[PDB]
Amino acid sequence: RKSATMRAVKRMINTHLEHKRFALINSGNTNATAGTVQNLSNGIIQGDDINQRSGDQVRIVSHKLHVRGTAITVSQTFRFIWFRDNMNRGTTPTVLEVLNTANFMSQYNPITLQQKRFTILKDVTLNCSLTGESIKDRIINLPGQLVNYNGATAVAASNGPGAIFMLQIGDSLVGLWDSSYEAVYTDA
Amino acid sequence: RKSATMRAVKRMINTHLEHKRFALINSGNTNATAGTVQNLSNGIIQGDDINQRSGDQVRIVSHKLHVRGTAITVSQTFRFIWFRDNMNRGTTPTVLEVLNTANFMSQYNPITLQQKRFTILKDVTLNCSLTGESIKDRIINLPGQLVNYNGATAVAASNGPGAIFMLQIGDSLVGLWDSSYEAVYTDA
Amino acid sequence: RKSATMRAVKRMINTHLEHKRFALINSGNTNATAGTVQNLSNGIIQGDDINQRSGDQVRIVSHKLHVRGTAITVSQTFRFIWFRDNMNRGTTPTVLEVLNTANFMSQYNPITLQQKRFTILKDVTLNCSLTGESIKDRIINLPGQLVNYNGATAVAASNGPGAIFMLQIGDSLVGLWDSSYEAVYTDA
Amino acid sequence: RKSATMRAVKRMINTHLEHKRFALINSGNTNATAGTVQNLSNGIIQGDDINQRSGDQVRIVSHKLHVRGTAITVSQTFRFIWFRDNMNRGTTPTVLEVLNTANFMSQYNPITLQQKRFTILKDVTLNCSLTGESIKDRIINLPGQLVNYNGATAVAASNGPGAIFMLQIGDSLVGLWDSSYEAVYTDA
Amino acid sequence: RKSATMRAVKRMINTHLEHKRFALINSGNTNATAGTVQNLSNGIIQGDDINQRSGDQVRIVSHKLHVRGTAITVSQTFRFIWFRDNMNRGTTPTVLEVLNTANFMSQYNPITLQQKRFTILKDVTLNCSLTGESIKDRIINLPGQLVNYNGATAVAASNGPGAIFMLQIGDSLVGLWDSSYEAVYTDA
Amino acid sequence: RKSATMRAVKRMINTHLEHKRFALINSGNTNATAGTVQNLSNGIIQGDDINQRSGDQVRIVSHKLHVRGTAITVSQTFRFIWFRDNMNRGTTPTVLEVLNTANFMSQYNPITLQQKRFTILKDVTLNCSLTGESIKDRIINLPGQLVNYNGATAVAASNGPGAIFMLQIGDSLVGLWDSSYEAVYTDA
Amino acid sequence: RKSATMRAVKRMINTHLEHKRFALINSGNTNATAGTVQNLSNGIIQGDDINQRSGDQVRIVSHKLHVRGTAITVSQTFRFIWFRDNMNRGTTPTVLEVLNTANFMSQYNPITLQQKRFTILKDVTLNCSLTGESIKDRIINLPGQLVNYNGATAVAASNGPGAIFMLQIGDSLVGLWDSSYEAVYTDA
Amino acid sequence: RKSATMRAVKRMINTHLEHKRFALINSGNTNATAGTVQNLSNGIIQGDDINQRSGDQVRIVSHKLHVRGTAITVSQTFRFIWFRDNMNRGTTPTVLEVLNTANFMSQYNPITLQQKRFTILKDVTLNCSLTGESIKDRIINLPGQLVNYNGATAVAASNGPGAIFMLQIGDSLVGLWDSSYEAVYTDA
Amino acid sequence: RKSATMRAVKRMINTHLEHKRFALINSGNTNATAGTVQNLSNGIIQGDDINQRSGDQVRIVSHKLHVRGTAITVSQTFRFIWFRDNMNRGTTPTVLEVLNTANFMSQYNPITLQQKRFTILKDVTLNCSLTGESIKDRIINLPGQLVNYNGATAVAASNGPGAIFMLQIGDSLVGLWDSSYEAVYTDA
Amino acid sequence: RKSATMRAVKRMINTHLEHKRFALINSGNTNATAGTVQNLSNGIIQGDDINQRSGDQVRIVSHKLHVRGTAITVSQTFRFIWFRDNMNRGTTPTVLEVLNTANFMSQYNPITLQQKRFTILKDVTLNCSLTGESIKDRIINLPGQLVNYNGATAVAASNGPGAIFMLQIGDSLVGLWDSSYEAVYTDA
Ligand SMILES: [Ca+2]
Ligand SMILES: [Ca+2]
Ligand SMILES: [Ca+2]
Ligand SMILES: [Ca+2]
Ligand SMILES: [Ca+2]
Ligand SMILES: [Ca+2]
Ligand SMILES: [Ca+2]
Ligand SMILES: [Ca+2]
Ligand SMILES: [Ca+2]
Ligand SMILES: [Ca+2]
Ligand SMILES: [Ca+2]
Ligand SMILES: [Ca+2]
Ligand SMILES: [Ca+2]
Ligand SMILES: [Ca+2]
């Protein structure tokens, strides 16, 4: 009925927009017991290319995260938290903004999750064993939202509301992890 | 049921376009008896930033003029004419193109208003009194239109059909006026 | 019915997009017995101007080809094949990719036409006679399609799927031909 | 029905207005490689006669262009571009305002055609051959529109929005062309 | 309706069959006053390639003839008779089988056209004038029929019922003519 | 209903065509960090046997990939990318045509995936652990599409639009991988 | 439903009758300023062959005239008048019976056209130029009527009501013309 | 309904046509191991009698074949193949055109039967035994078709499309066979 | 109705496929008391001719057996068993696979007829009497089924599921029998 | 409705038939690189007990296969192919009849799978790892079909159409596998 008419309107809108693609790779990082936060959507900068943007908005159609862990010298845990910062004013968020404590086992920060500063996209835990599977990986594909920006370059000050991030935290410092990201997006 | 569904299609179209914003300030200008014409939409130049444009068209969603006059040494009248040039071929229009005579009390130019060279957005008259209210101001908000451009930079030759202008004219030379403008626009 | 309001949805979509225009002229070329292939849509490069593009996709709304032959020293034939390379990977197609043999009388290449590598837009034959009408010309105007690109500049490696090309081939070497091209397109 | 009732209203209106007529001839002109622009509707001046106007507006009911080409010393091309200047502010448009380059093979000016500064009524190419048909001609009849004026006399400063022009451009300087024009119009 | 559903069944049948293509060229031939008969479909021989066939039947989907004539030393006429031999038993048909007399002006053979031995596909007459247009061409595209074969190779004995031929006849001997032929066919 | 009627029409079409079958095996290959691209559909060559083809088209009904990896001397990753080359013009595609970088973690090439040069059929990642499960395999079965060919033999120049390939890439060089492939197809 | 039933009756009547064919050629005739009248249907004589007749009636199903002119020594006009004599009593009609004067420019004879002695089938005028196209031709195909006869042989006295004729008249004596005629007819 | 009144229309058509009859007897012929082909419908020649024809077409209403074998010196087989040559061009068909080999046991020629050069009316096998029934016979009565002719007399060159023939072939040379034929036909 | 719609779908499928034809003859064979088994469908080998096949499947549309027996020196019986081997794996079946004992009077093999290894097409018994009718024949025509092949050539190892055979068995050794076979088939 | 009461008819039929059960165990077999084929349904021999049969037919209601691999000295792969020979004539099938090559990675035999000689019931791959899970197993339970037999005892010559077999093939020779089988069947 009319709801199918409106979804057809959305599809024919999307046939007139270029679906731009940005890809990213991030390899050879050590497991962090205190945790690190990695930028994902920040690499889309202002310009005229296929992985660049016009203005301070894109609209992510779909976006895909691939994480991979490798246990070195001990069996260990890799935790990856794919999340969206709905309220970013030009920073990279810290670990204690996202987690209640800077421990890999921790639950989320109660205040920032109550006020919906962050939306969790996926919480992935890889347990890599030196006597079992020492290499584990996970690929997650999700539809995206609006991404606002506060600048033109690929710095932390260009992050805006809707910026996509990944937190890595684990129980060791020795093991290694890799990451890759793509985002299909429109820039109308 | 016809305009409502076409209105919803307009909502879905506009939620896919980046609404870009350009702001402008213009302070410390003397009152003009012969009148001057100021540029408003000309400062949207070609580029990739939020206040810039792609190509030679933008479509103003809404735009806002703020005028303010203050009387110096005599009581005087400030007249601000917010207008759109429908037929601009790369100039800034003169005062006698818009007004019948170059006087602050004048009615519009009959020939150019007959052929609809200009559309008057708002005609504002501020009377500033040194024995009463010496400072007056006025803020006007309007929905916009298509703006064509004839160039890439912020010169008069880049003005095209649909360009937004402001005419200031008064009855003294010594009083001061300020203006500020902002336009919300799409660049699809 | 709903098909016509879908048409009105498409028209009001196209109202919000800038219709960018690219123009090109190519004069003073000799008739070729082995044939040459000329680039048409390749001249739309990345940038912010009215004849430039963002990203790697444009959608040609309409595009117009003007070919013109002039007989020199003999009465001769000019053949112009306006075509779309549906599968281009960053080249300019050869004459034997399009035509079964490199002769002006030849039918199309059977394999590349069976696999729909090329869509023929228009095949135009001008017979210019030194005892008759020594100058002939033809203008063809057609609705367009999606054009993909593989690069940012105007080289052969930026041609992509949907690229517009023109093949000239004739029966003499000494006659002259001119061509010109324009493309109305959106770059959303 | 009601649409034909409104059509009968329009016919009853047009039976109460004098249909004025203006004729023009322009013979013995050489072919221009850079191009020239000729005035057509400029010759309706203010006055009380049958080919004159009252005020600054007329409404062209129908208007008819006749062009003719004659090859002298070489076979050549005559290009005639009948067009309406929608945005004229008291000039005769130049060639580069209409055409992208000043060549007879050129496509239109992308900027001025995007902003609809000009509406092309008819584009006519005559190829005249000293070994074939040395004389060619073409007669085009079209319904008209509102023509505004900016003055009273038959000068370029009296041209206004909706003025009718013809651009001649060719590939030689030697051959001769002729023109004639009529306009049937109401002056209510 | 019945025709619509059988048409959809026919499209689903044809999209499951390979549309094979055969191309032919035939240049540099003199005008014949007695007339000659050329083979068109005979070059589809038995084999496994895209321009070959399996068995003794193909079904031509569409096929395309291109004829071209050029006058040498006299103004002359070229006649081309595209025809299908419905009843061929392994020959190339003679001129007097098709035409009532071996003259370029002659009507068809009354007996063989009465018994429907031949079906005329197109009868094309080119008048080439050395004081006017000395080079003429004509391209004809038509849907095809079943073709049977009496052999495997490209000899006249492999021609069968449904074979495609072109008769050329003219009024001079010295002028030249060119031809080329394409056939899109299925081989199920 | 009528959709099931066209479904039964497709059933009766397919029961009148021979379902031909081609099988391939490919063992004893080393893990590649730069990645290699293997041919799958290319082994169907022109001929008259059950695993051969007529002409330059087959229609794959279903086809089946079996990959297998075994870790040697280190725990490692094997990535297999089953993909269809929609736009192949007689090559074997390179790794950087498919992947954004030549690394086993990399996302796809943004340009070639935007223009739909490739369609990914399956992306399979095997992590082989010398302290856990050092041998992994994966069998994928999928319905097929049309395959075009540019030649007759089993060379890369015979690959055409619709050709089937497998990209293998990993994080070590010394581990081994095996593959086998089946394609059920019609050749009508 | 009425006319279609009677139409099917006529078609099934015509399936039971032999469609007899008569062909004719007439070449190498000089252009006549006073005009000549040529016999077309008179060559169907009494007998038993395919181009002969039984009795004094045939019914022409369709019939085809081919005229061709060639300018010699001057550019000249060839006029061919294909016509039916509805009232022939065993003559060949003169030129002044058909035309008002024996001039090539003349209109028809007013008395014989008022009383419908003649029905004009086609009036064809060929202008052949020694500096343009010196050879022109025309083929006309028409359905026929009843032809009565007054005798058995191919003489003028055998012409009857419904006899088919061709008048040639021109403006020179030097140029040459050819003719051919064909008639499909039933003889029940 | 209308189908029966179309049948009545056909019957009243056939009431107005003379049903002409031709009769033929062929006695005293020896059995043939290589086979012979006999003419049946060829004996209807041009003329005015009851067993003759006008033009080149008759329509056989019904036709009747009587074959009769007689064994001499051995028990043997007589095979009679009554058939219609659909594509005859003025010959008598050979035995190898009909039969795959020239043996009495042979199946039909696959190529000429696939292209429908011949329609088999009746295949009749008589086994005559010198210790049993030494004389056998068979009469077959069938409705007929259109017969075209290529000449006026009773020679092989007058056979045309639709001609009726009979093939005798056996396993001995010394036995005798007789045949007789009649054809009821219309000659409208 | 819709069943006739599916029937028309089958007819329109079959008019798009070549009906290929294979013919066989087999003469001069002695009567067998132990019985022999003859190959019928095996002679359709892989190739490109009208009596050859593509791949390993054909679909027999109709096929025709002709048997004939002649008594020598004794009155005797000839039995012919036309049968389809449903389950053939590359052999010629033996007599005891079909018959319960190797005698001309025997009923079928109970096990192989229970499991439907064979389908009997026709069981023909000719009694040839030297004091009566010493020569008998019988022609059987039947619609066909799918035939699979296990090879390419005309050997017993190419016989597959659906192969057609004839078993001959009798009660004497000295009498002679003849056979021939046709198969109309599709090879899509 | 009628489908449910036909189901109830089948259930009340199966209530009156004894559901006979046969069980089988096969332990201690080595992994095979060339592969072996094991008999499953062959052990149901003729007799009167619960695991025996009457006649040559049973109908398997359900049947259950349990395979189990154990890695010895190397990590290896066990492949078990549970299949039904639809066309067995008293053999045990070879490995090359089922698989295209005698390798554990191989796809199926294309010819025998096209002619449906075998139906694959289940293809099972066990990867046993000496550093991981060294013992794997799998139980598959399926509804059965008709089984025909060719003899009374448990030899290969009693296998018939519908016989159940298992193929083991692997990549090592020293690892061990066990299997067990049961079949619930009726013997009416
Ligand atoms: Ca841009
Ligand atoms: Ca944007
Ligand atoms: Ca005060
Ligand atoms: Ca824009
Ligand atoms: Ca774009
Ligand atoms: Ca007026
Ligand atoms: Ca083949
Ligand atoms: Ca074929
Ligand atoms: Ca094919
Ligand atoms: Ca007669
Ligand atoms: Ca008559
Ligand atoms: Ca007749
Ligand atoms: Ca086949
Ligand atoms: Ca039983």
Swiss-Prot record, chains A, B, C, D, E, F, G, H, I, J:
Query: Which residues make up the binding site for Ca(2+) 1?
Result: E18, D48, S54, Q57, T131, D187
The answer to keyword RNA-binding applying to this record is yes
Please name one Pfam family that this protein belongs to. Answer: TNV_CP
Q: Which UniProt keywords apply?
A: Calcium, Capsid protein, Metal-binding, RNA-binding, Virion
Q: Which domain of life is it from?
A: Viruses
What cofactor does its activity depend on?
Ca(2+)
Q: Where in the cell is it found?
A: Virion
Keyword Calcium assigned to the entry: answer is yes
Which positions are annotated as binding Ca(2+) 3?
Answer: E18, D48, T131
* Cited InterPro entries: Satellite_CP-like, Satellite_virus_coat, Satellite_virus_coat_sf, Viral_coat
Q: What residues bind Ca(2+) 2, as annotated? A: E18, D48, T131
Give Gene Ontology CC terms: viral capsid
Cofactor binding note from Swiss-Prot or TrEMBL: Binds 3 Ca(2+) ions per subunit.
Q: What is its main location?
A: virion
Q: Which GO terms describe its molecular function?
A: metal ion binding; RNA binding; structural molecule activity
Q: What does this protein do?
A: Self-assembles to form an icosahedral capsid of 17 nm in diameter.
Q: Under what name is this protein listed?
A: Capsid protein
Species per Swiss-Prot/TrEMBL record? Satellite tobacco necrosis virus 1
